[PDB]
Design a protein around this ligand. Structure first.
Ligand SMILES: CCCCCCCCCCCC(=O)O[C@@H](COC(=O)CCCCCCCCCC)COP(=O)(O)OC[C@H](O)CO[C@@]1(C(=O)O)C[C@H](O)[C@@H](O)[C@H]([C@@H](O)CO)O1
Lengths: 256, 226, 115, 32, 258, 31, 30, 28
């Protein structure tokens, strides 16, 4: 048996286990992951519909919200769920074909599959309501989505490796995932904030990725200066390098 | 004096209310050693801890004028992040003793335990023998009218059991025991009268031999059901 | 510290005091509201001026000289809380008047309602 | 407003009596 | 001696306060550094973000004291919620001595947080006086009354959450996540006067906004308050929450022992 | 304001007495 | 509007029933 | 302001002492 085949086997089994425990005993989690974008959209439109109409009179608010929200939901899930994978299977590390990175990859693939299903369903009901739901340049959208996915998975693995001890710090990162929602262009277009606050917001790679995904989605969408893809690409590459290094070095102490 | 009135104890289960105790009324004899023995899981331990006051009875109450110790070997009783010394300090501060007396108690328990370097170490890293040792030493520290043992004698190595028995026979005469053990020789060696708790009721026997004989008879009756 | 003492000293006594005050001892107070605005003849500063001047002291001197406020507000002797005790200080009289006359501002319209 | 004040006061002292009675029972729970 | 229940209550509260201070401040007292570091960091970030905006908003009050007076009470409230809610699992093994009822853990954590934030508040006013700002309240006992109302509301909410989420150890994270927008909306960083009126009544549903505004008003001289802000609404919220929390604790008193 | 200042003084002197009693109790227990 | 107020009365009656049942359970356990 | 400067210098010097003593004790 090749190492690749046993890797597929262990990933399949771990995916089955983690999909069973991610949703409820009678699949109550699927309702929550379908309803959370709905509640977010309801609150956001009912709070800023006229303001966003005044912002630019060319893009409807719900499609803008979906395109900026579903990738952020996937990124937040990848960051916040990948790091609990170590403590969920402490007792499972006794069968000599199971490694922590297998749990990491299983959780990541599930997060990706679930959010992709949610994205497809959301685009379907958005087109069903008479909105705009076809990306003009879908290949660049796929590229930016892949960059965002790799950045999120790398950060999740990095936080899983570093915070194997001190679980209080785990909680902390979830708190820091709340302001990241309110800054990275998810709610309101970034053309309305006063310009001197701009570069302090431009070190956030998720802002750049959201802006480029929206630009590749809509026809004739305007981006600001310094919203290059090179900065998120380099951030993701460096984060993945450091995460893999730290997992390799601190490998043996992730035992039972 | 020990009196029990209208005791009712249960816990909710998915298959209904598994009732353990229901309206128990009984008076215990004084100045004699009690061997409390019954069917395993039929209510021995809950009776012990309601006697120890850990769980107050939902209905009825117990009335006493003597001091009854908490179950010895209470390793889970002490909190993990504190050291053995800090747990001891907390325990004597619970009972509101004086400063110098409680200093005497912590010196006594550190002399008994003989742990040394790990005595000022938090107890999440402790092994079972060390926590059992400090539990035994702390329980022997307080002067109490009655003591509760949940079969904590036979555990441990030979030397710890030896000094445990030594300080125990130092405590007999001025104090009395309640034994909850599965070794019959302990009840024939350290008990005067024997109670038997079966199916939610307790029966007294002034003869220890009669009590253990009724125990084997009840076991044979349980094994005789087809 | 039985339950009877707690019920007597926390529920029955204060309700009894409030009942024997608000039923047989309290004095009725009639309100007379009005709604005004000041305009230039062919305005937020003038309505601030009016809002300050209504609670002023010189207006109280003029009104006490005119309509005899002090001896009117001392008439109800049954109620001891809302009546104006005779021989009180000028500052207490000013605070009593400020409590009695209530002025609210509608900033959307700049309308002064005086009750 | 006599009746509104009386009802508000009745609710307030009812809640206060309930809270202090629960506190009294809670401290009385200790029976060493 | 018979040792009346008030005496043993004092004894277990005193001992449990020692036990809980030994871990809240951390071993070797490393936590006090973060305890007085957090308001400093908050003050610095908010002042270099919004100093000119606050100066243009209301010039009668300088920014740091307006920040402190709404920051430290909210820090006390947040401590009295989050620290208090997890008071059950941290001492679950301690419930075996018959004088260790969980309400003692709740009260010990509440008094520890109260004392710590009181010393932090006194140090903050001392520093503000040392830097030449305005640091003496004009109506001190009214400020004490509003602070007491806020304290008892926070303690009641903490006890209610600790009672409710016992079988469910989760939803504590959701409590903290919901506590963050409470920081961002209660007007503890910027004056609430600049909020557009169409959002105003909904924001009045939050009692912490009322308590913060009432504590600020009794502190500064000539600080206006908005219409619809009163003491009766947060006082009633606090009283009802305290009654509900005590009643829920009385129902499930036996279930908080394992 | 005589009685008002007396009342606030009572409140503050009490609060600091409680806090310092707690801190002297824990510093007595520690050493 | 006959049907509109009936729903509000149903909701408030259910709320009052729930809270009164809970306090009655409290005073029964006492 | 001589007394003011002496007092704020004293406070900072004590703080510095506190932090360096705490780290030099906790490194052990
Ligand atoms: C001011 C900025 C925005 C306003 C937020 C206001 C905070 C809400 C109020 C507090 C809500 C709340 O629940 O508290 C939170 C505090 O908010 C944060 O996380 C700050 C986030 C920083 C990242 C932001 C990046 C932005 C992203 C841009 C790209 C957790 O902290 P906590 O005080 O509750 O933790 C105490 C625990 O009991 C024990 O943890 C320790 C301890 O004492 O052993 C250990 C460890 O040192 C650390 O976890 C902890 C401490 O020291 C480290 O700050 O203390």
């Amino acid at each position: 048996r090749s190492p690749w085949q046993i890797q597929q086997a262990v990933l399949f089994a771990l995916f089955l286990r983690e999909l069973k425990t991610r949703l409820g005993g009678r699949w109550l989690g699927v309702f929550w992951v379908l309803l959370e974008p709905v509640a977010h959209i309801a609150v956001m439109t009912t709070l800023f519909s006229l303001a966003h109409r005044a912002a630019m009179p060319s893009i409807e608010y719900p499609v803008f919200l979906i395109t900026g929200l579903i990738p952020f939901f996937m990124f937040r899930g990848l960051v916040t769920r990948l790091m609990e994978a170590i403590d969920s299977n402490r007792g499972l590390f006794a069968y000599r074909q199971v490694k922590p990175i297998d749990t990491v990859i299983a959780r990541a693939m599930l997060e990706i599959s679930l959010q992709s299903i949610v994205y497809l369903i959301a685009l379907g009901t958005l087109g069903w309501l008479g909105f705009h739901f076809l990306p003009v340049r879908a290949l660049e959208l796929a590229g930016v989505s892949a960059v965002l996915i790799m950045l999120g998975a790398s950060l999740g693995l990095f936080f899983a490796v570093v915070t194997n001890e001190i679980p209080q710090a785990r909680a902390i990162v979830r708190i820091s995932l709340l302001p990241l929602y309110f800054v990275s262009g998810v709610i309101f277009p970034v053309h309305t904030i006063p310009p001197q606050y701009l570069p302090l917001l431009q070190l956030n790679p998720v802002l750049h990725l959201i802006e480029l995904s929206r630009a590749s989605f809509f026809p004739q969408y305007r981006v600001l200066q310094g919203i290059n893809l090179a900065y998120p690409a380099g951030f993701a590459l460096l984060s993945l390098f450091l995460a893999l290094m730290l997992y390799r070095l601190r490998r043996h102490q992730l035992a039972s | 004096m020990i009196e029990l009135r209208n005791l009712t104890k249960w816990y909710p289960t998915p298959h209904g209310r598994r009732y353990v105790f229901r309206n128990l009324n009984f008076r215990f004899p004084d100045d004699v050693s009690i061997g409390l023995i019954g069917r395993n899981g039929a209510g021995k331990s809950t009776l012990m801890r309601l006697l120890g006051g850990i769980e107050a009875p939902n209905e009825g109450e117990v009335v006493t004028d003597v001091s009854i110790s908490w179950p010895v070997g209470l390793s889970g009783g002490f909190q993990g992040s504190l050291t053995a010394r800090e747990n001891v300090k907390f325990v004597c501060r619970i009972y509101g003793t004086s400063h110098e007396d409680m200093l005497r108690k912590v010196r006594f328990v550190e002399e008994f335990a003989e742990i040394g370097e790990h005595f000022d170490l938090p107890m999440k890293t402790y092994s079972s023998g060390m926590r059992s040792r400090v539990a035994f030493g702390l329980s022997m520290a307080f002067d109490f009218d009655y003591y509760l043992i949940d079969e904590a004698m036979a555990v441990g190595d030979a030397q710890f059991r030896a000094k445990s028995r030594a300080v125990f026979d130092s405590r007999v005469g001025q104090a009395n025991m309640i034994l909850v053990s599965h070794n019959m020789n302990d009840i024939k060696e350290y008990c005067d009268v024997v109670v038997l708790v079966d199916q939610g009721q307790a029966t007294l026997y002034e003869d220890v031999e009669a009590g253990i004989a009724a125990y084997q008879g009840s076991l044979k009756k349980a094994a005789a059901k087809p | 510290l039985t339950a009877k003492r707690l019920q007597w000293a926390l529920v029955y006594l204060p309700m009894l005091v409030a009942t024997v005050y608000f039923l047989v001892f309290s004095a009725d107070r009639y309100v007379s509201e009005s709604v005004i605005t000041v305009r230039q003849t062919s305005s937020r500063e003038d309505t601030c001026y009016l809002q300050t001047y209504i609670h002023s002291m010189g207006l109280l001197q003029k009104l006490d000289q005119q309509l005899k406020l002090r001896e009117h507000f001392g008439t109800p002797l049954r109620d001891p809380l809302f009546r104006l005790w005779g021989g009180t200080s000028q500052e207490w009289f000013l605070e009593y008047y400020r409590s009695r006359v209530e002025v609210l501002m509608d900033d959307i319209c700049g309308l002064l309602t005086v009750r | 407003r006599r009746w509104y004040n009386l009802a508000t006061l009745l609710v307030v002292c009812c809640l206060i009596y309930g809270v202090v009675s629960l506190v009294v029972a809670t401290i009385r729970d200790h029976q060493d």
